[PDB]
Amino acid sequence: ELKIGDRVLVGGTKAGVVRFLGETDFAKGEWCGVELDEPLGKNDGAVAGTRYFQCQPKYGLFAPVHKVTKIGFPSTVRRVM
Structure with missing residues (x-):
């Protein structure tokens, strides 16, 4: 199961680390807040005036857990894995 701190892919295409789960x-x-390695995200850890975590702008994404997979495992559009 996913834990804060885990290395993940979002949608099989974007790598990052779990910063939030709740x-x-x-x-x-339950949603996973991920801080990406690359500026391919859409937030900085907040949405609509609720903050869930803080990261650099453009590096944050939220996804349902079913769209988040630990690096090294199959994730299921071209995907990394």
Whole structure:
């Protein structure tokens, strides 16, 4: 299972680290907040005036856990793995 600090791919295409795992104000269920290696994201750890974590702008992404996979494992559009 995913833990804060894990190295992951989002959507099989973007590598980063789990910075946040929990409930949010923008959707149901548990979401993974990932800080990407590259500026391919859409936030800095906040959405709509709730902050979930802090990273550099353009490096943050949130995804449901079903879209986040640990590096080294199959993730399921061309994908890294």
